[PDB]
């Protein structure tokens, strides 16, 4: 039902902010985008840029992904990202996360046509 593109958007795109507002951003957002449904996703990253800017990363620096595939792309500029890490206290279904804001280059895995991001690989 949901496409790879769509999933990327849902899990990682939060254009409606320039940075995780409070310190309870991950808890609210992780839960509201269904990343805590079957279990607590250990780590997640949201990107606080426009869709267009993130989808343009597929045209930038071609890098190897972590799994070995070579269709990964690193952003020229640095972007506003929020690292969401699961605490120790967290336990399904009460998922607890620590919000860690940062500005780094995002590495994404791109595919399909239009050639859009389908997976968030790394931030560097």
């Amino acid at each position, epitope marked *: 039902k949901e496409t790879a593109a769509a999933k990327f958007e849902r899990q990682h795109m939060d254009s409606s902010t320039s940075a995780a507002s409070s310190s309870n951003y991950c808890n609210q957002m992780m839960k509201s985008r269904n990343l805590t449904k079957d279990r607590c996703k250990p780590v997640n990253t949201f990107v606080h840029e426009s869709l267009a800017d993130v989808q343009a990363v*597929c*045209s930038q*620096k*071609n*890098v*190897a992904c972590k799994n070995g*595939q*070579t*269709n990964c*792309y690193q952003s020229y500029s640095t972007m506003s990202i929020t690292d969401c890490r699961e605490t120790g206290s967290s336990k399904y279904p009460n998922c607890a996360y620590k919000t860690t804001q940062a500005n780094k280059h995002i590495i994404v895995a*791109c*595919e*399909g*046509n239009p*050639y859009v991001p389908v997976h968030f690989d790394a931030s560097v």
Partner: nanobody, 121 residues
Framework: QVQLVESGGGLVQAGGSLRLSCAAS????????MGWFRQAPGKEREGVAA????????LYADSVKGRFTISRDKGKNTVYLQMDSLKPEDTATYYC??????????????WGQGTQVTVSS
């Protein structure tokens, strides 16, 4: 604006040879993987051969192994396809592609416009 320009297409006799050329213009870095795909009239696009930017992680479709050779200028955005012992079956429009993985069609986001290669019985 990155263009992928291909050349070398032609019409040849069964058993003859052709050489396909492709260079990426306007790309600041080097695409790890560059390869060739082809689409026979009506049918679906299929991968022909691919190689990475270093010596190679070369890969060939089963129909062209031993007849076609791919090559890249080490560290550059160029791909070549020497096509020997061409056969009617090879008639198709060949496409150069960059920035993908192996022969995985969906992973390639930079596509040439296509070069017709026709081999007559």
């Amino acid at each position: 604006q990155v263009q992928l320009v291909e050349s070398g297409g032609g019409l040849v006799q069964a058993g003859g040879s052709l050489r396909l050329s492709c260079a990426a213009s306007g790309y600041a870095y080097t695409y790890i993987y560059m390869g060739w795909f082809r689409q026979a009239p009506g049918k679906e696009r299929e991968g022909v051969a691919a190689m990475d930017s270093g010596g190679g992680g070369t890969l060939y479709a089963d129909s062209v192994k031993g007849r076609f050779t791919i090559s890249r200028d080490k560290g550059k955005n160029t791909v070549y396809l020497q096509m020997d012992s061409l056969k009617p079956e090879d008639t198709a429009t060949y496409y150069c592609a960059a920035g993908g993985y192996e022969l995985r069609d969906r992973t390639y986001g930079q596509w040439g416009q296509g070069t017709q290669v026709t081999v007559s019985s």
